[PDB]
Amino acid sequence: IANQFNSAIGKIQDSLSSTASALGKLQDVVNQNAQALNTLVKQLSSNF
Amino acid sequence: NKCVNFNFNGLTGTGVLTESNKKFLPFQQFGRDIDDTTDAVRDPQTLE
Ligand SMILES: *[C@@H]1O[C@H](CO)[C@@H](O[C@@H]2O[C@H](CO)[C@@H](O)[C@H](O)[C@H]2NC(C)=O)[C@H](O)[C@H]1NC(C)=O
Ligand SMILES: *[C@@H]1O[C@H](CO)[C@@H](O[C@@H]2O[C@H](CO)[C@@H](O)[C@H](O)[C@H]2NC(C)=O)[C@H](O)[C@H]1NC(C)=O
């Protein structure tokens, strides 16, 4: 139980470290929030 | 290092001006970021 658990914690480092994209659920909201501040500012260039 | 309004070569803006570590190529005069907002200018007399 300890060794399966140590091998299980072992791969949880690797899934982040080797970049499995799973943090996408945070990244995508950091992107989705930023794209709105970029969009908001960029419209000040428009003549209306 | 003061809040001033400015006009440089007709480009009008406002802010705190300061010395820059950036290096434009000899033909660029005004910097613009991702946002398309004017973050830096070459001075037309010291050329820095
Ligand atoms: C139950 O499964 C575990 C795997 O989680 C087995 O443990 C492995 O046993 C082999 C030898 O048979 C070792 O070479 C491996 O290193 C062991 N794995 C780990 C993670 O330690 C265990 O033998 C199995 N037992 C039964 C009764 O099925
Ligand atoms: C505008 O004139 C000023 C001075 O009249 C020029 O500044 C000089 O530049 C040289 C080379 O960098 C320095 O050795 C001098 O010390 C500067 N002058 C002073 C008074 O310090 C400036 O280069 C001129 N601008 C242009 C575009 O020719």
Side-chain angles (χ1 to χ4, degrees):
Chain A
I1 297 165
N3 283 319
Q4 282 189 115
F5 179 100
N6 290 165
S7 78
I9 296 296
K11 299 197 190 81
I12 294 303
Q13 313 162 115
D14 299 347
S15 180
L16 308 174
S17 177
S18 71
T19 73
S21 78
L23 310 86
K25 295 199 66 64
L26 307 182
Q27 189 60 55
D28 298 348
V29 302
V30 169
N31 296 1
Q32 182 185 166
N33 292 148
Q35 190 163 111
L37 280 194
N38 179 31
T39 297
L40 174 61
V41 170
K42 196 183 312 300
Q43 287 205 8
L44 296 175
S45 70
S46 299
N47 298 57
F48 292 150
Chain B
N1 309 91
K2 289 188 72 191
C3 185
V4 309
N5 275 330
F6 61 84
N7 175 335
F8 309 142
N9 312 318
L11 189 154
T12 301
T14 309
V16 183
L17 309 169
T18 196
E19 184 267 5
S20 185
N21 60 57
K22 293 184 174 69
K23 301 292 149 62
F24 297 7
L25 305 167
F27 59 84
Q28 294 149 314
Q29 291 164 350
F30 320 127
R32 301 178 186 270
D33 63 348
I34 306 97
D35 323 16
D36 296 295
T37 64
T38 307
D39 70 343
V41 172
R42 178 181 286 155
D43 179 82
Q45 313 199 320
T46 190
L47 296 295
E48 175 62 306

